[model samples]
Target: MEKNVTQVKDTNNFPYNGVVSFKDATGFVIGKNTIITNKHVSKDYKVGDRITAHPNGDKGNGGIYKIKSISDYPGDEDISVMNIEEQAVERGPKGFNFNENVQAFNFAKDAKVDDKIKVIGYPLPAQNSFKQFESTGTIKRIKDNILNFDAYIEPGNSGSPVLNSNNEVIGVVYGGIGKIGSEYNGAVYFTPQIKDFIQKHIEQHHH
Candidate 1:
C-alpha cells in the first residue's frame, strides 16, 4: 500500500464494481453501457480494445467488454465518454453480462473546495496486477473546469473517477504534478457544460 492509499480487496461490490481497467488507464461506468475517462487515455483506445471490469489481476473480476466507440469532449477538456458492447467479450469470475455485474455511478449535484472525496482506479497497474486502489482526500481547489485534490495518484490512474462522499462522481482524474502520491492532482470537474456533454452521449447510447 502507498501512503494515504489502500487496496480495495472487494471490487465486486457497489461503487468499486463501477470502476473499469483499460489497457493503461482507468474509467468508470455511468450509464447502462457508457463509461467516462480522460481524453488522453481514451485517445489511445480503439474500436476493439478490451476493458476489464474491476479486475484484480487475472482473477476476481466482473467481465471484459470490447470498446465500440470513443467520444472526446469537443472543447479543450480532458473528459472522454465511451460506449462498450452489451455482452462481455470475455467472462471473468462474475460471468459475461457487463451491465448486470458492474454498477453505474451517478453524478454529484455540485462540488466545492474542501469536500471530502475518494479517488479510485488501477494505479501502477503493471506493478499491482490491475487491482483496484483508492486514495482519500479533500478537494483542494476548484478553478474553471478543473478540480485539484491532494490524493496520492499515479500514471495508470488517469481517467479514474473522483467521487464525493456519497460515491457520486464529481470529476474525472486526468493528471498531476508528479508520480506516486502527487500533492497536486487534477481532474476535469463536472461543470454544467461538461455534464451536458456527457449526458448527451449517455442518452444517445442508453439501452
Candidate 2:
C-alpha cells in the first residue's frame, strides 16, 4: 500500500522530526504529547494500544508509547489525532521527560500556492531501516482541506509533516499523488476542522 521514494536522504540536523510508527505506516508529532496520522495508518489499532513514537530514529529516543485516544473522524478526511504519555514513553519506575529535546511545530491553517514547505518522516522503513528523511518543495495546489505539493514522498511517508517556510506545520500527510516519482504529494490541510478535532480530543483525554 506504500510506495518507495526516488531517493534516500538522511537527517543530519533537523528538529521536530518525530516518526509515529503503526507497525507499518508512519506518523509525526504535532504536540508534546500528541501525534497526527491518517486513520488508515492506525485503522486496526485501538485505544490503549501500546504505540511507539521516536523523535530520533530507530537508534535514538525510540521508545514505547500508547494510543490513549483517537479522533472520531476517519477515511476520506482521514484526520486522526492520537494522544501519548510522553512521561510514560519508554520510562522506568522513576520515569523521564523527553519533551526537553523534542520540539513540536505549530499547525498552520493558511498558506498560498507556490509557498515553500518541508515534509519530514521515515520513508521506506525496510530500506532505510526506519531512518528519518526530509523532502522540500512548494505548494502546487490547495483544496478545501488538502494540500497538493511538488514534494517527493514515499509509502512510509504517510503522517509526515508538511511544514511551511516558517518551520510551522501546514498539514499532515496521508499520501502523495499515488504515483512514484510524481511531483504531486497530498496532505490533510490543517484547517479549523482538524484544529478543533485535535483540540477537543486532547482536552477530553487529558481532562
Query: Against the hidden reference, what TM-scores do the models get?
Result: 0.92, 0.79
What is candidate 1's lDDT per residue for 96-141, written digit by digit as tens? 7778879899999899998988999999899998889999888989
**Whose TM-score is greatest here?**
1
The 10 consecutive residues of candidate 1 with the worst lDDT sum are 175-184
lDDT tens per residue, model 2, 1-207: 122333324232344435556655667766767777876666767877765544345455445677777774643686688777655557522235434334466767599998988877777777776666667788888888878888777677777778888777788887434546555778888878677777665432233
Q: How many pairs collide in each candidate, listed in order?
A: 0, 1
Runs of candidate 1 with Cα error greater than 4 angstroms are 92-94, 175-182, 203-207
The best candidate by lDDT is 1
Give model 1's clash tally.
0
Q: How does candidate 2 score on lDDT?
A: 0.66
What overall lDDT goes with each candidate model?
A: 0.86, 0.66
Off by over 4 Å in 2: 1-14, 55-58, 74-76, 92-95, 98-101, 175-182, 203-207
Among all windows of ten consecutive residues in candidate 2, which has the lowest summed lDDT? 1-10
